[PDB]
């Protein structure tokens, strides 16, 4: 880079793009493409060079176009992904110029950038498909551009395809001219002002189902064989689109909106303006073969991706340090829209579980402020983590419960209007709230520690007569104050309940209770991003109540108490026995949210013990939890009867009983599976129990082979994923290895399912070591397919490491990562992984001998 005219990661500010015209001629059979982009730019400062982004481009020609065309010289700096155009005459300030670069390139074999893949039809024909995934930083691999989100421009896109293939892009199509040799050239209309990471184009054989919605054509695309499965998606997109245009008070601005089920896609979906793109398993749906977890997944993702058309596309963060302004808003709007127009799905259970898991991570010293400087490519990819998504929506949810829902909307609508087709940073949002409260509250001041400081506060609560003493401190095990909007509910001696709110912006304070009260619970429904720790008498009060009658608290409040007690046991604020004391109430619980959280704490302790060789202790622990839930597990029916939350409770209890061979569930499941196999896979299996039935079946070599045959045979991808979870839960190490190797190479299983497979293998005893070895031995190939730092990698590092609980393993994991580049060693997921092992070591030090005692007999 020493003879390159630019020394920094971030492009200069002296030249800005106005309009791109991109012409691509891709070849899916040779996996290459020819390109010619033409950029109109304006120079704001006198410069001799244009610094631009480009990787993997064999550039044949560069010309400064006018009348007279001037050839220009081009320099490359691949370490920074940058190229430098040397101008023949200096670019003057206040002038604009038009640049043209003709180039050729390979189509990607990764999931990043303009990538191409191959699939097999039902008629057993091989088919070719090409698609884009640019966010965060791959647009530059497709065409030269100013590949930073603040450089918003307009795009005209042109594709030369073979006539059998459809070409979609962000904007509607304008023209189609038929050329020689079976080729068409599709031209698309010029786009709105957008960032380069949103540009998208697809080439593949696809059918469509469309509906006009008030002048905007809404279409669902999929390969021809799956087109019968897009109806639900179409219905749901219409509902959410009219809900969002109403709540935001800004119409969706493009004449069409496409949603595309891509046969091979790593993310769950991508929010490209006008061309939303999804995994097949996250868009297609069939009530006959898809569980209610599947339904809810399709509807969540749609809600999330549609919300990005306003939060992210219309209004974009200036730089990736504020990614949470896109992803936090989209995740809030996803779960908010679901509670207003799809209450029945009880999506709040999903949002609550996700916040519980984000908080465990956010509690580690390897956590970062949700707004953190990032400059390196891997630092940018790592910004796509749970904090951006679920601590960002928790910040919004804390504000929405604090201020009115009406105040919140006012601020949202004002924010989006002011900043349409432009860029924003954190303070711009805190301003819009300040304007809506007519500057009474200083939102910018209150939101400071939540935005700039990692972690969350521990609120400690003690009752003294008719008052509550409240304090706050940082939640950590070896820092500024937070402005904490506190909520409490309390039951009086006349058995009357009251709730109120108070804002703790100092270290300590006293809440005046107007009466004397039986118990008190702070942080209603965990609408605040903090953990609450009670004095001993005040835990006991809440525990005594849960045994007498748990239903004076909501089911979110009860899930919150189980999560907080166990997380406070890890910290050491309460002995582990008090956690177990609390979930002894579970005999009277029959709601999903609390049972789900108890089973997770239970299963996490089981999976830890099992790896350490304490197979006896683990099993004692599940049999004690089984007795607590015995009545609930035995009521369960093997059907799809009931509300969504009851169907989800059914799957959790039958999965927990079958997995630990408790009761006769094993036997019921084997009988149902064996009758399924006799039918040759044609008998009705209830969707709710299909994971569980398959898993039991996959434990024999006959049933394993049978399941595999239908995996490569059936048309329901959601059913295929239940088969894959059952296949990957075999105890036959040869088969597990064969499953990972196969997904990694793209044969039979697609590389998109690898993270799922690796994690399933690594969760149980047979594959535990196997999965971590596959990760270590295939690290370099993994990082060819998935970018270093991205969520797929974070998910693989975490899922293969987090059940290690020995000093030896700690040093192994650390030393393996030190043998990689510093960029790899200093990845946040790698550091978080090392801290989680260290906490396992200490948790076992503190709690093992006493756990052996309460399970003695």
Ligand X SMILES: O=S(=O)(Nc1cccc(-c2nnn[nH]2)c1)c1cc(Br)c(Cl)s1
Ligand Y SMILES: *[C@@H]1O[C@H](CO)[C@@H](O[C@@H]2O[C@H](CO)[C@@H](O[C@@H]3O[C@H](CO[C@H]4O[C@H](CO[C@H]5O[C@H](CO)[C@@H](O)[C@H](O)[C@@H]5O)[C@@H](O)[C@H](O[C@H]5O[C@H](CO)[C@@H](O)[C@H](O)[C@@H]5O)[C@@H]4O)[C@@H](O)[C@H](O)[C@@H]3O)[C@H](O)[C@H]2NC(C)=O)[C@H](O)[C@H]1NC(C)=O
Ligand Z SMILES: *[C@@H]1O[C@H](CO)[C@@H](O[C@@H]2O[C@H](CO)[C@@H](O)[C@H](O)[C@H]2NC(C)=O)[C@H](O)[C@H]1NC(C)=O
Ligand U SMILES: *[C@@H]1O[C@H](CO)[C@@H](O[C@@H]2O[C@H](CO)[C@@H](O[C@@H]3O[C@H](CO[C@H]4O[C@H](CO)[C@@H](O)[C@H](O)[C@@H]4O)[C@@H](O)[C@H](O[C@H]4O[C@H](CO)[C@@H](O)[C@H](O)[C@@H]4O)[C@@H]3O)[C@H](O)[C@H]2NC(C)=O)[C@H](O)[C@H]1NC(C)=O
Ligand V SMILES: *[C@@H]1O[C@H](CO)[C@@H](O[C@@H]2O[C@H](CO)[C@@H](O[C@@H]3O[C@H](CO)[C@@H](O)[C@H](O)[C@@H]3O)[C@H](O)[C@H]2NC(C)=O)[C@H](O)[C@H]1NC(C)=O
Ligand W SMILES: *[C@@H]1O[C@H](CO)[C@@H](O[C@@H]2O[C@H](CO)[C@@H](O[C@@H]3O[C@H](CO[C@H]4O[C@H](CO[C@H]5O[C@H](CO)[C@@H](O)[C@H](O)[C@@H]5O)[C@@H](O)[C@H](O)[C@@H]4O)[C@@H](O)[C@H](O)[C@@H]3O)[C@H](O)[C@H]2NC(C)=O)[C@H](O)[C@H]1NC(C)=O
Residues binding ligand V (CB under 6 A): 18, 42, 96
Smallest distance, ligand Z to C-beta of residue 2, A = 30
Give the C-alpha separation, 402 to 423, whole Å.
27
Q: Which is nearer to ligand V, 171 or 260 (CB)?
A: 171
664 binding ligand NAG? (CB under 6 A): yes
Radius of gyration, CA atoms only, the chain: 28
Task: Choose from ligand V, ligand Y, ligand U, none: what does 183 bind? Cβ within 5-8 Å by kind.
Answer: ligand Y
Q: Which is nearer to ligand X, 269 or 325 (CB)?
A: 269
**Contact indicator for 825, 419 with CB cutoff of 8 Å:** no
User: Was 271 annotated as part of a binding site?
Assistant: yes
Instruction: Give the list of residues 6+ apart from residue 123 with CB closer than 8 angstroms, or none.
Output: none
Task: Choose from Zn ion, ligand Z, ligand Y, none: what does 208 bind? Cβ within 5-8 Å by kind.
Answer: ligand Z
The closest alpha carbon to 781, from 744, 818, 750, belongs to: 744
- Give the C-alpha distances (Å, rounded to integers) separating 293 from 62, 296, 300, 347: 52, 5, 10, 10
Instruction: Kindly indicate which of the ranges 114-122, 179-187, 562-570, 640-648 contains the residues binding ligand Y, using the contact rule CB under 6 A.
Output: 179-187
Give the C-alpha separation, 856 to 278, whole Å.
51
Q: Which is nearer to ligand V, 87 or 677 (CB)?
A: 87
User: Was 135 annotated as part of a binding site?
Assistant: yes
Q: What residue is closest to ligand U based on CB? A: 590
Q: Which is nearer to ligand NAG, 63 or 814 (CB)?
A: 63
Q: What is the DSSP letter of 466?
A: T
User: Was 308 annotated as part of a binding site?
Assistant: yes
Task: Choose from ligand NAG, ligand Z, ligand X, none: what does 341 bind? Cβ within 5-8 Å by kind.
Answer: none
Give the C-alpha separation, 344 to 60, whole Å.
58
Give the one residue of 375, 514, 679, 680 binding ligand W; rule: CB under 6 A: 514
Q: Which is nearer to ligand NAG, 667 or 784 (CB)?
A: 667
Q: Report residue 205 CA to chain centroid gap.
A: 29
Task: Choose from Zn ion, ligand X, ligand V, none: what does 18 bind? Cβ within 5-8 Å by kind.
Answer: ligand V
Task: Choose from ligand Y, ligand Z, ligand X, none: what does 749 bind? Cβ within 5-8 Å by kind.
Answer: none
For ligand Y, the binding residues in 146-175 under the rule CB under 6 A are 160-164
Please identify which residue in the block is written with the tokens 């835990």: 539
46 binding ligand Y? (CB under 6 A): no
Instruction: Kindly indicate which of the ranges 171-179, 274-282, 288-296, 510-518 contains the residues binding ligand W, using the contact rule CB under 6 A.
Output: 510-518
As given in the structure block, the two tokens for residue 680 are 């040759």
301 binding Zn ion? (CB under 5 A): no
Task: Choose from ligand Y, ligand NAG, Zn ion, none: what does 330 bind? Cβ within 5-8 Å by kind.
Answer: Zn ion
634 binding ligand NAG? (CB under 6 A): yes
Smallest distance, ligand Z to C-beta of residue 253, A = 9
Catalytically annotated residue among 21, 266, 281, 305: 305
Task: Choose from ligand X, ligand U, ligand NAG, none: what does 587 bind? Cβ within 5-8 Å by kind.
Answer: none
- Give the C-alpha distances (Å, rounded to integers) separating 328 from 306, 339, 671: 14, 17, 46
As given in the structure block, the two tokens for residue 600 are 């997770």
User: Was 268 annotated as part of a binding site?
Assistant: yes
User: Was 715 annotated as part of a binding site?
Assistant: no
**Contact indicator for 63, 70 with CB cutoff of 8 Å:** yes
Q: Which is nearer to ligand Y, 121 or 467 (CB)?
A: 121
| Pairing outcome for strands 201-204 and 183-188 | unpaired
H or E segment and range at residue 280: helix 280-283
Instruction: Specify whether 305 is catalytic.
Output: yes
Please identify which residue in the block is written with the tokens 């609930």: 632
267 binding ligand X? (CB under 6 A): yes
For Zn ion, the binding residues in 313-332 under the rule CB under 5 A are 327, 330
As given in the structure block, the two tokens for residue 33 are 């493409």
Phi, psi values for residue 444, rounded to 5° = -60, -35
What binding mask, one character per residue, do residues 43-62 give for ligand NAG by CB under 6 A, x or -? -------------x-x-x--
User: Was 544 annotated as part of a binding site?
Assistant: no
Q: Which is nearer to ligand Y, 225 or 835 (CB)?
A: 225
Q: Which is nearer to ligand Z, 439 or 780 (CB)?
A: 439
Please identify which residue in the block is written with the tokens 């989100």: 149
Give the C-alpha separation, 402 to 441, whole Å.
11
Phi, psi values for residue 828, rounded to 5° = -65, -35
CB < 8 Å & 24+ apart, contacts of 709-713: 710/681, 711/748, 712/748
Q: What is the DSSP letter of 372?
A: -
Smallest distance, ligand X to C-beta of residue 304, A = 4
**Helices and strands counted in the chain (H then E):** 32, 29
Give the C-alpha separation, 451 to 372, whole Å.
9
Q: Which is nearer to ligand V, 16 or 484 (CB)?
A: 16
104 binding ligand NAG? (CB under 6 A): yes
As given in the structure block, the two tokens for residue 813 are 């994991």
Q: Which is nearer to ligand V, 42 or 109 (CB)?
A: 42
Cis peptide, bond prior to residue 136, ω within 30 of zero: yes
Phi, psi values for residue 434, rounded to 5° = -60, -35
Paired residues of 504 in beta bridges = 484
**Contact indicator for 370, 392 with CB cutoff of 8 Å:** yes
712 binding ligand Y? (CB under 6 A): no
Instruction: Kindly indicate which of the ranges 27-35, 573-581, 667-675, 786-794 contains the residues binding ligand Y, using the contact rule CB under 6 A.
Output: 27-35
What binding mask, one character per residue, do residues 310-349 give for ligand X by CB under 6 A, x or -? ----------------------------------------
User: Was 764 annotated as part of a binding site?
Assistant: no
Report the phi/psi class of residue 681: left, alpha or beta, with left for phi > 0 and alpha for psi in -120 to 50: left
Paired residues of 492 in beta bridges = 517
Smallest distance, ligand W to C-beta of residue 447, A = 24
Give the C-alpha separation, 710 to 680, whole Å.
9
Smallest distance, ligand V to C-beta of residue 99, A = 13
Give the C-alpha separation, 658 to 406, whole Å.
47
639 binding ligand NAG? (CB under 6 A): no
Binding residues (CB under 6 A) for ligand U: these are 590, 646
- Give the C-alpha distances (Å, rounded to integers) separating 367 from 341, 359, 361, 446: 35, 10, 7, 21
**Greatest CA separation for the chain:** 92
**Contact indicator for 487, 528 with CB cutoff of 8 Å:** yes
Instruction: Kindly indicate which of the ranges 133-141, 554-562, 574-582, 662-670 contains the residues binding ligand NAG, using the contact rule CB under 6 A.
Output: 662-670
Instruction: Give the list of residues 6+ apart from residue 649 with CB closer than 8 angstroms, or none.
Output: 590, 591, 592, 595, 632
**Contact indicator for 72, 33 with CB cutoff of 8 Å:** no
Give the one residue of 479, 496, 667, 713 binding ligand NAG; rule: CB under 6 A: 667
27 binding ligand Y? (CB under 6 A): yes
User: How many chain residues touch ligand X (CB under 6 A)?
Assistant: 12
Q: Which is nearer to ligand Y, 60 or 713 (CB)?
A: 60
For residue 730, give the 3-state DSSP assignment: coil
Give the C-alpha separation, 507 to 807, whole Å.
37
For ligand W, the binding residues in 464-503 under the rule CB under 6 A are 492, 494, 496, 498, 500
Give the one residue of 45, 65, 73, 182 binding ligand Y; rule: CB under 6 A: 182
The binding site for ligand Y (CB under 6 A) comprises 27, 29-30, 160-164, 181-183
Please enumerate, by residue number, every residue annotated as part of a binding site for Zn(2+): 304, 308, 327
Q: Which residue numbers are catalytic?
A: 305
Annotated binding-site residue numbers for substrate: 135, 268-272
> Which residues fall in the annotated binding site?
135, 268-272, 304, 308, 327
Binding site for ligand W (CB under 6 A): 492, 494, 496, 498, 500, 512, 514-515
Name the residues that contact ligand X, by CB under 6 A. 267-269, 300-301, 304, 350, 354, 384, 386, 389, 791
Give the interface with ligand NAG as residue ranges (CB under 6 A): 56, 58, 60, 104-106, 634, 664, 667-668
Report the interface residues with Zn ion, using CB under 5 A: 327, 330
């Amino acid at each position: 880079g020493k003879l390159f005219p630019w020394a920094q990661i971030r492009l200069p500010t002296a030249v800005v793009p106005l309009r791109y015209e991109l012409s691509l001629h891709p070849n899916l059979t040779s996996m290459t493409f020819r390109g010619s982009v033409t950029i109109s730019v304006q120079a704001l400062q006198v410069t001799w060079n244009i610094i631009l982004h480009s990787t993997g481009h064999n550039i044949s020609r560069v010309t400064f176009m006018s009348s007279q065309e001037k050839q220009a010289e081009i320099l490359e700096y691949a370490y920074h992904g940058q190229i430098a155009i040397v101008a023949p005459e200096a670019l003057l300030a206040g002038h604009n110029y038009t640049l043209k670069i003709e180039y050729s390139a390979n189509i990607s074999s990764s999931y990043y950038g303009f990538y191409g893949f191959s699939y097999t039809d039902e008629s057993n024909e091989k088919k070719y498909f090409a698609a884009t995934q640019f966010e965060p930083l791959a647009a530059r691999s497709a065409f030269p551009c100013f590949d930073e989100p603040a450089f918003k421009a307009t795009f005209i896109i042109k594709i030369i395809r073979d006539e059998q293939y459809t070409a979609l892009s962000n904007m509607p199509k304008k023209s189609s001219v038929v050329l020689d040799d079976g080729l068409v050239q599709d031209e698309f209309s010029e786009s709105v002002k957008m960032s380069t990471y949103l540009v998208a184009f697809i080439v593949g054989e696809m059918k469509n189902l469309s509906q006009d919605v008030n002048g905007t054509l809404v279409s669902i695309y999929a390969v021809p064989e799956k087109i019968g499965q897009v109806h639900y998606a179409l219905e749901t997109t219409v509902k959410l689109l009219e809900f969002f245009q109403n709540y935001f008070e800004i119409q969706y601005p493009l004449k069409k909106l496409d949603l595309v089920a891509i046969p091979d896609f790593e993310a769950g979906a991508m929010e490209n303006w006008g061309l939303l793109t999804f995994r097949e398993e996250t868009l297609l749906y069939d009530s006959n073969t898809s569980s209610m977890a599947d339904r809810k997944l399709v509807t969540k993702i749609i809600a999330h991706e549609l919300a990005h058309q306003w939060f992210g596309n219309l209004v974009t963060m200036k730089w990736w340090n504020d990614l949470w302004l896109n992803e936090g808003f989209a995740t809030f709007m996803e779960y908010f829209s679901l509670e207003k127009i799809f209450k029945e799905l009880s999506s709040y259970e999903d949002f609550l579980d996700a916040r519980f898991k984000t908080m465990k991570k956010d509690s580690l010293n390897s956590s970062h402020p949700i707004s953190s400087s990032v400059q390196s490519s891997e630092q940018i990819e790592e910004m796509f983590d749970s904090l951006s998504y679920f601590k960002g929506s928790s910040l919004l949810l804390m504000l929405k419960t604090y201020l009115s829902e009406d105040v919140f909307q006012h601020a949202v609508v004002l924010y989006l209007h002011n900043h349409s087709y432009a860029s924003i940073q954190s303070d711009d949002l805190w301003d819009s709230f300040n304007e809506v409260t007519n500057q009474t509250l200083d939102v910018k001041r209150m939101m400071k520690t939540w935005t700039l400081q990692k972690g969350f506060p521990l609120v400690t609560v003690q009752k003294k007569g008719k008052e509550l003493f409240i304090q706050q401190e940082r939640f950590f095990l070896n820092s500024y104050l937070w402005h904490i909007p506190l909520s409490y509910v309390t039951e009086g001696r006349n058995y009357s309940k009251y709730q109120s709110v108070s804002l703790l912006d100092k270290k300590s304070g006293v809440i005046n209770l107007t009466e004397e009260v039986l118990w008190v619970k702070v942080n209603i429904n965990m609408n605040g991003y903090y953990i609450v720790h009670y004095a001993d008498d005040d835990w006991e009060a809440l525990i005594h109540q849960l045994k007498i009658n748990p239903y004076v608290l909501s089911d979110k409040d009860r899930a919150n108490l189980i999560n907080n007690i166990f997380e406070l046991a890890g910290l050491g604020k309460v002995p582990l026995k008090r956690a177990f004391d609390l979930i002894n109430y579970l005999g009277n619980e029959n709601h999903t949210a609390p049972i789900t959280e108890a089973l997770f704490q239970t299963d996490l302790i089981y999976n830890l013990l099992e790896k350490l060789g304490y197979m006896d202790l683990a099993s004692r622990l599940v049999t004690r939890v089984f007795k607590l839930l015995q009545n609930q597990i035995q009521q369960q029916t093997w059907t799809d009867e009931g509300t969504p939350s009851m169907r989800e409770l059914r799957s959790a209890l039958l999965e927990f009983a079958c997995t630990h061979n408790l009761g006769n569930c094993s036997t019921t499941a084997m009988k149902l599976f064996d009758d399924w196999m006799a039918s040759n896979g044609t008998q009705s299996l209830p969707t709710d129990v299909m994971t569980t039935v398959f898993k039991v079946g996959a434990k024999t070599d006959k049933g394993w082979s049978f399941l595999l045959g239908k995996y490569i045979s059936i048309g329901s991808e959601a059913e295929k994923n239940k088969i894959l979870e059952a296949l990957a839960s075999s105890e036959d190490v040869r088969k597990l290895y064969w499953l990972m190797k196969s997904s990694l190479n793209g044969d039979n299983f697609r590389t998109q399912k690898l993270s799922f497979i690796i994690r399933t293998v690594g969760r149980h005893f047979p594959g535990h070591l196997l999965a971590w070895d596959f990760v270590k031995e295939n690290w370099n190939k993994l990082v060819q397919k998935f970018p270093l730092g991205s969520y797929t990698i974070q998910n693989i590092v975490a899922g293969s490491t987090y059940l290690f609980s020995t000093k030896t393993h700690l040093s192994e994991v650390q030393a393996f990562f030190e043998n990689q580049s510093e960029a790899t060693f200093r990845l946040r997921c790698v550091q978080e992984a090392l801290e989680v092992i260290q906490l396992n070591i200490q948790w076992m030090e503190k709690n093992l001998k006493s756990l052996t005692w309460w399970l003695r007999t």
